[PDB]
Ligand binder design. Structure first.
Ligand SMILES: [Mg+2]
Ligand SMILES: [Mg+2]
Ligand SMILES: [Mg+2]
Ligand SMILES: [Mg+2]
Ligand SMILES: [Mg+2]
Ligand SMILES: [Mg+2]
Ligand SMILES: [Mg+2]
Ligand SMILES: [Mg+2]
Ligand SMILES: [Mg+2]
Ligand SMILES: [Mg+2]
Ligand SMILES: [Mg+2]
Ligand SMILES: [Mg+2]
Ligand SMILES: [Mg+2]
Ligand SMILES: [Mg+2]
Ligand SMILES: [Mg+2]
Ligand SMILES: [Mg+2]
Ligand SMILES: [Mg+2]
Ligand SMILES: [Mg+2]
Ligand SMILES: [Mg+2]
Ligand SMILES: [Mg+2]
Lengths: 139, 131, 135
RNA sequence: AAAAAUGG
RNA sequence: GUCGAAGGUGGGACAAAUGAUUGGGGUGAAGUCGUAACAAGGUAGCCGUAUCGGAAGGUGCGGCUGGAUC
RNA sequence: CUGCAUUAGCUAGUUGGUAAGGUAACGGCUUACCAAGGCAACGAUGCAUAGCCGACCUGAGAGGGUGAUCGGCCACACUGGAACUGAGACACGGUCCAGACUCCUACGGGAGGCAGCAGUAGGGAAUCUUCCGCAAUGGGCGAAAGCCUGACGGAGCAACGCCGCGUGAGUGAUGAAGGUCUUCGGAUCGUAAAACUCUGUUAUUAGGGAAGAACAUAUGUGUAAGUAACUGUGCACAUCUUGACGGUACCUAAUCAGAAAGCCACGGCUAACUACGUGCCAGCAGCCGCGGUAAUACGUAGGUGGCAAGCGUUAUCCGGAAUUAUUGGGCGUAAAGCGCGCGUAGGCGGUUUUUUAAGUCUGAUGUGAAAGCCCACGGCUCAACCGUGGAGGGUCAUUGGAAACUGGAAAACUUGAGUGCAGAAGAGGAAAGUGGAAUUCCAUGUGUAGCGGUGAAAUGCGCAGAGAUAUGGAGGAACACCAGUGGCGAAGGCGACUUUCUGGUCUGUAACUGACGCUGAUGUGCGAAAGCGUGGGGAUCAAACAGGAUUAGAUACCCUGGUAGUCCACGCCGUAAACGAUGAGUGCUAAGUGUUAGGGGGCCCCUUAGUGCUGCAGCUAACGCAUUAAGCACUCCGCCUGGGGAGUA
RNA sequence: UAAGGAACUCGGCAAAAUGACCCCGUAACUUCGGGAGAAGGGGUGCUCUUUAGGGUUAACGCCCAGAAGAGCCGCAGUGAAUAGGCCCAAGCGACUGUUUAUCAAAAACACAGGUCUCUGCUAAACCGUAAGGUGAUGUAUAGGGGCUGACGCCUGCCCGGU
């Protein structure tokens, strides 16, 4: 890892010397991916980086960014009640989760009647759902 | 112990002037007498008397107050001190209150005022300011 | 103090610290050591890019980058303007000036220099954001 | 002269 | 032959980097436990010292008023 | 002429001498012998950093910061050592050796060193073209013509800086159209625009075209020295010839307002406000902060402000900052008086006379390069710029004068400081001895159903006879009443009485010494309580601990016990809100009133030294202080420089 | 004993290596004694010249013992023999000592120090049926027994059971 800056500089110089060789960082996986015209091209470039630029590198199949989804629907309830002393912390919700049509994205519906959940906190509920969904529930 | 008789005399004058006393008895010395005589000549004090008693002698100053009881002496400041002595050249003689005050100086030509020092073109140890 | 005390131990002034320490240090690779050179800007490579929440009472998602400078010092630099094209391994120019809200962010990324792109749609004070005159 | 906590 | 650069060997000195692990420090949120201080803060508080206790702290000895209703 | 003591010891050719050698030269420069010297708290040694200066930036100044360009000096030439040649080198483009590194080789051997001018790679936020010429100045050789000179003189590139001039000037209400806002009246961009008139800085084209050029040499004429004379030599006057820049600057004539305006800001500081969009998001921000639906703070628009070929941002220095205070601050409560003595060095020091002239003051002379800052003048059309002449800059050096003050010398004085003599009080200290009250325990007599404790209880003790009560015994610790902003001590502290040893303080004389003084870094001692070590002692009280209560819990407060300790001797520890949160010494500045120890004069007056209260002037942010200052002054010391991190590593 | 040098082996077992004297020099740590012969280096024969001394004597003489210089020889000069290998760490026991005569020398025992406990003297404890003895011709700063085991810092809670 001490040669990562050298690696970046070498990659830049190699891209400048060869239009067809590309290097880019993948945000979801964080890995640096090198694209080329073929196995021979990438092998030659790797050897060149190892010796000409003295940056020994290892290459592998790029990681694939997976996603999760709900196959079955269900009504559920989340209750967080820490009332041990003084001013505490209380929250309660009853939410129906349903599998959306693939590619339609996340859809939040507000079927609150009678102000059981004050209208101030509903955006907070939606934000909590989004934040908790960003982190996977299965993997 | 006592370390600056000139400063003690000036402080006696300052305290008496504050309290609006009329006279002032202090132990005498030649430098003190010359300072007192310069003050009289310039008009900051009314009178000076010397008592040649036993021991050191005594200087008896009589202070001067203007109309409305206004004090003629506004302030006295020791300039040269035992802890740090100040001397000035003839061309560097300071003007007290833009000339409205006097700087008592000690020179090879006797202790005089800054006006006389400038006139005679001499310098020396700036004993004090009086305005 | 007395004049004698001042002669014995003279007065000593308070020493002043720089607000942008990372710009005051160079690196000599041959001798592998640091050097004291004052720079108005330094080049760096974005080790990380992302958003930070400002300290209270402010609230926002302020865009910043963790940058390793040419002198091997790693700093946090704020990205000014609306929208940026920076990612990890981007080469950027960094100038002094901290962002009061962000605790550990003490530098700014110059817009319109090296990889960083000018602000799109900016029309007033463009020079501060590296945007060409639209005309 | 019994005990009576806490409150982004 | 004298002196003599560089080099070799040896035990020390100093400085910097790094090191499993570890100590306290700061910062961050609306976390957990209690409530020690500010009112006589519900045992006046604080200072040095000793010891004890999850924690704030408690207790002992001496000191201070920067405390003291009637 | 620089930082560090969280660097205090360094030095053995080291310090001196004798002799010799050596060098231009003196000298431990080197070598033999004799001695143990030499440096250092006035900072040696060590470590870190650094070319020095003229100057440059900043500041009202004092000061603070810097050491590009240009000039002076020093040092170095891939790293280290050495000499030869030479007047001069231990020599950038010279030699030898070693080392690292390039290139050639036939492998035996050779060549080389851009921190010269361009340029390359690299590093960097960033810094120029592999130019013309020796025509000017200067240098090397030569008698000279002359040759060499990347010094230098000039072009190219860069708003990098300063300075100068542009991007038009005049009339123009008819307030055109259009943008923005609007109370829908209009307001504003606006004399701005358009149209008319003019000008050519500048630009384009065509002509003329400097100075920088002195010359040297050559050629005639003379004139001075010397020669018998001559050539020659020097000088004077004369004549032809020499320009890279460059046909550049500049001047003249013609054509056109036509090619030539952008940047930041408009909440306060701080000159400049409205609309729309967004809605604690997006974003802004130097600091205070601005943004959650009607934002002069975000983004855009119009308008406005400040500048203008620049305008902003960032970095660095000085200023503002009196925020290290010499000028020019402070330490009762804001940060800051060491807990307190005894004292060394240093600092400072009472009155008079004579003398000296180191400090001080006043002249003369030399010097402080040039350039630069400043003043004046002159030259580029002005300015920047250039030149000339002044002015200034020293803590500088020699030399002549003055003598008040500081310093040196000599001599006198008694007020400060001590000594003598007469008194006074004291829980001042150390060591023995003797008492009385009470607590605890123990032994007896009487006597019985509790005692003890709490808010209430319980634990506990008692019925195996407690507690209560009477007599005696053992032992330890502290000394009721007197007792009081009373006393003593440097502080910590010191309270029964007696004896022994011993310190300090106050009052009154003025015999005596005659400034012997004050402060005090470093040192050296004392220093509450707790605590530690050895040995002793052990009543009471009581950390820890154990029960009993209280409580949601109660590792507490309350109750019952209880070990260390509390006590003693000798050592150690060295800290406290060790406080008046107020260093010591000295003098001066209204008063009223109590008290302790004295003294003098008639219950009263005066006075010395303490100890309290009230209270002017003055001081203070205020509170307050106020002859026991926190006032007015002088000397010395200690200490402070936003909070936290941290009295930590 | 070529080259190698722990690759051997459970293990450097054995062997090799060091070894004398003089000189220089010598670390962490420490209870301040030490560690230390730490370590790591230099010298060592013979001849001649010059030259400071010490002991014994009237002196001569005899004996001891240095310093400087210049030379000579060999592969090598404490030329043979005899004469420490050293260093960095960890566990255990403080240390010197004692032990399974004849398979165990140790971390076991002892130890100075600590603590508990008994014992008032015809002591307690111990030998003996007793007499008589040890203890001790001592007397609580003494004597016997138990446990611990230098020194430093310390040694908590439980008395229901025995
Ligand atoms: Mg609250
Ligand atoms: Mg409380
Ligand atoms: Mg309390
Ligand atoms: Mg407790
Ligand atoms: Mg340097
Ligand atoms: Mg040369
Ligand atoms: Mg304070
Ligand atoms: Mg004090
Ligand atoms: Mg062999
Ligand atoms: Mg062999
Ligand atoms: Mg093996
Ligand atoms: Mg094997
Ligand atoms: Mg063996
Ligand atoms: Mg043993
Ligand atoms: Mg043994
Ligand atoms: Mg045996
Ligand atoms: Mg055996
Ligand atoms: Mg055996
Ligand atoms: Mg044992
Ligand atoms: Mg043991």
């Amino acid at each position: 890892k001490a040669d990562q800056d050298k690696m970046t500089q070498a990659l830049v110089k190699l891209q400048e010397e060869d239009p067809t060789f590309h290097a880019h960082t993948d945000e979801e996986t964080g890995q640096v991916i090198i694209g080329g015209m073929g196995e021979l091209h990438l092998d030659i470039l790797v050897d060149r980086m190892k010796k000409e630029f003295n940056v020994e590198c290892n290459v592998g199949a790029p990681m694939v960014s997976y996603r999760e989804t709900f196959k079955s629907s269900a009504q559920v309830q989340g209750k967080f009640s820490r009332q041990s002393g003084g001013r505490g912390q209380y929250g309660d919700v009853h939410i129906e989760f349903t599998p959306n049509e693939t590619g339609a994205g996340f859809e939040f519906e507000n079927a609150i009647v009678g102000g059981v959940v004050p209208r101030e906190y509903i955006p907070s509920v939606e934000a909590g759902l989004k934040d908790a969904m960003e982190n996977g529930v299965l993997a | 112990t006592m370390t600056d008789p000139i400063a003690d005399m000036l402080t006696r004058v300052r305290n008496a002037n504050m309290v609006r006393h009329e006279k002032l008895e202090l132990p005498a010395s030649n430098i003190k007498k010359e300072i007192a005589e310069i003050l009289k000549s310039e008009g900051f004090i009314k009178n000076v008397e010397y008592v040649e008693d036993d021991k050191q002698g005594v200087l008896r100053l009589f202070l001067k107050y203007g109309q409305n009881d206004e004090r003629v002496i506004t302030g006295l400041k020791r300039i040269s001190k035992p802890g740090l002595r100040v001397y000035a050249k003839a061309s560097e003689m300071p003007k007290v209150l833009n000339g409205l005050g006097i700087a008592l100086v000690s020179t090879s030509e006797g202790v005089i005022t800054d006006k006389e020092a400038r006139k005679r073109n001499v310098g020396g140890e700036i004993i004090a300011y009086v305005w | 103090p007395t004049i004698n005390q001042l002669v014995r131990k003279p007065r000593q002034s308070k020493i002043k610290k720089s607000d942008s320490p990372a710009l005051n240090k160079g690196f000599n690779s041959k001798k592998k050591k640091f050097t004291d050179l004052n720079s108005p800007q330094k080049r760096g490579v974005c080790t990380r890019v992302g958003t930070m929440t400002p300290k209270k009472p402010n609230s926002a998602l302020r865009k910043y980058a963790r940058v390793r400078l040419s002198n091997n010092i790693e700093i946090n630099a704020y990205i000014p303007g609306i929208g940026h094209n920076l990612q990890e391994h981007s080469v950027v120019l960094v100038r002094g000036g901290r962002v009061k809200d962000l605790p550990g962010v003490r530098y700014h990324i110059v817009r319109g220099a090296l990889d960083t792109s000018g602000v799109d749609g900016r029309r007033q004070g463009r020079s501060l954001y590296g945007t060409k005159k639209p005309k």
